[PDB]
Amino acid sequence: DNTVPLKLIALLANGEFHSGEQLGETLGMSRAAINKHIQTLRDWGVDVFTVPGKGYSLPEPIQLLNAKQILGQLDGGSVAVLPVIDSTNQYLLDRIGELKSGDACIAEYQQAGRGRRGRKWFSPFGANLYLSMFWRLEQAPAAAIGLSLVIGIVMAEVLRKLGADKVRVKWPNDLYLQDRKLAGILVELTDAAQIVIGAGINMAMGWITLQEAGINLDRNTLAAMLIRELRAALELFEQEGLAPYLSRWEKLDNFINRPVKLIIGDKEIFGISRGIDKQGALLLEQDGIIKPWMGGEISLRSAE
Numbered sequence: 001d002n003t004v005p006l007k008l009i010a011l012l013a014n015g016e017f018h019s020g021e022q023l024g025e026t027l028g029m030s031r032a033a034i035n036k037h038i039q040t041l042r043d044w045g046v047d048v049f050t051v052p053g054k055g056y057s058l059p060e061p062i063q064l065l066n067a068k069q070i071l072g073q074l075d076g077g078s079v080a081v082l083p084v085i086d087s088t089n090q091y092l093l094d095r096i097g098e099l100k101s102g103d104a105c106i107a108e109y110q111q112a113g114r115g116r117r118g119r120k121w122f123s124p125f126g127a128n129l130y131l132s133m134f135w136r137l138e139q140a141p142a143a144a145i146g147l148s149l150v151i152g153i154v155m156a157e158v159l160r161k162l163g164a165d166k167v168r169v170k171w172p173n174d175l176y177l178q179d180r181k182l183a184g185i186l187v188e189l190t191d192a193a194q195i196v197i198g199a200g201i202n203m204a205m206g207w208i209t210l211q212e213a214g215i216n217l218d219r220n221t222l223a224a225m226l227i228r229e230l231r232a233a234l235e236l237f238e239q240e241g242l243a244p245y246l247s248r249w250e251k252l253d254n255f256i257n258r259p260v261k262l263i264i265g266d267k268e269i270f271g272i273s274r275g276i277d278k279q280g281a282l283l284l285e286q287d288g289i290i291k292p293w294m295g296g297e298i299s300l301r302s303a304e
């Protein structure tokens with residue numbers, strides 16, 4: 001049961017020192033129990049500083065997700081704000097039968113956040129944005145490439161609009177900053193098709209954060225903007241496909257005309273990227289010849 005640590009971080013969020021005694025009085029608990037639950041916050045990835053014999057404090061204030069503020073500025077779908085969840089993608093999947101296109105979910109903390117191919121996504125409490133959105137496509141796509149490109153484009157453009165000028169996209173589904181992974185996108189597919197989109201963006205916390213690049217964004221504002229723009233963008237993709245996104249992709253293509261490596265299955269091939277075709281397939285030039293690819297993991301190829 002997570003109610004007591006949640007009430008605890010809710011109090012500690014303002015960055016002010018609280019005594020063990022006053023936290024106990026406020027929460028109607030002993031100082032021993034408080035000390036126990038403080039440790040739980042540490043397990044969740046919260047940086048907590050203990051003043052020996054006196055109490056506790058966060059080193060800095062943290063901005064907690066405000067549901068009322070996020071909901072208030074959005075329209076056209078439900079948005080659930082969850083303090084603790086296993087995975088925002090899974091939360092939407094569990095209820096995929098009662099959801100409408102645009103229904104979204106945001107978590108402070110994921111206990112079982114996942115990347116692609118069964119990997120894990122480190123999702124400490126309050127440090128980053130963990131967002132998911134449900135969408136229904138009336139005609140099922142044959143692949144997740146188009147959707148991923150649309151998500152990556154939109155989230156990059158939003159971050160760029162907010163000051164993160166150098167954010168680029170890694171085909172087909174990661175945002176990169178300074179050639180390092182800033183954000184991860186996971187699209188899960190199931191006549192029509194049901195889609196659960198998942199985005200993890202590193203803010204405060206190989207990898208790179210927005211803060212490590214001097215970008216300090218309002219997490220509530222960022223969440224709302226992403227949800228707002230994704231809904232409209234998915235409507236556009238729904239109506240017109242990838243076509244109106246092709247030029248917008250070129251401006252964000254992080255690996256175009258660069259030497260890259262593509263891990264496909266358990267084969268590893270080398271080539272130079274020439275961008276994408278109209279279907280969003282990677283155009284990889286091997287030995288002077290360009291071939292389209294609708295799969296594989298792309299990465300930079302250099303011993304620099």
Ligand SMILES: Nc1ncnc2c1ncn2[C@@H]1O[C@H](COP(=O)(O)OCCCCC[C@@H]2SC[C@@H]3NC(=O)N[C@@H]32)[C@@H](O)[C@H]1O
Nearest residue numbers: 087088089113114115116119121122184185198199200207
């Ligand atoms: N915060 C992190 N930042 C950078 N690298 C990391 C992070 N955590 C783990 N990694 C590394 O990346 C790999 C997994 O990332 P990915 O498969 O590229 O996965 C890409 C897709 C990620 C989707 C995450 C969102 S979050 C909200 C939603 N809910 C959920 O469970 N997934 C999505 C791991 O092997 C690990 O080494």
